[PDB]
């Protein structure tokens, strides 16, 4: 049966200006089945309070969710999202780039 792999975008809600409040988001989309592990990481450590949207899906039935957390960017700190799903042999890590 169908297995579709998650597309992952990790980004902030507002343009990242260091010292200022923002939300780090990891949008995972286009997957099936719906079990998927998504973590947001700060310098490698998994971030403790990450919330997400309520499971919904697109026209082709694949799923999408938005995981997000409050953060204040620094030039120094590194952020990333780590995702797991049956379609992924190993947890896919995508690093946040503020120009993307």
């Amino acid at each position: 049966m169908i297995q579709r792999t998650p597309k992952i975008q990790v980004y902030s809600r507002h343009p990242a200006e260091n010292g200022k409040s923002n939300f780090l988001n990891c949008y995972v989309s286009g997957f099936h089945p719906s079990d998927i592990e998504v973590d947001l990481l700060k310098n490698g450590e998994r971030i403790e309070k990450v919330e997400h949207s309520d499971l919904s899906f697109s026209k082709d039935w694949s799923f999408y969710l938005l995981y997000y957390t409050e953060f204040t960017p620094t030039e120094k700190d590194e952020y990333a999202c780590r995702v797991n799903h049956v379609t992924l042999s190993q947890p896919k890590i995508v690093k946040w780039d503020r120009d993307m």
Binding site: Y11, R13, N25, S53, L66, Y68
Partner: peptide, 15 residues
Amino acid sequence: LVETRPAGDGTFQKW
């Protein structure tokens, strides 16, 4: 072209 993302406050983003 990225897929239109949610910003998380009810609006969207795209580049």
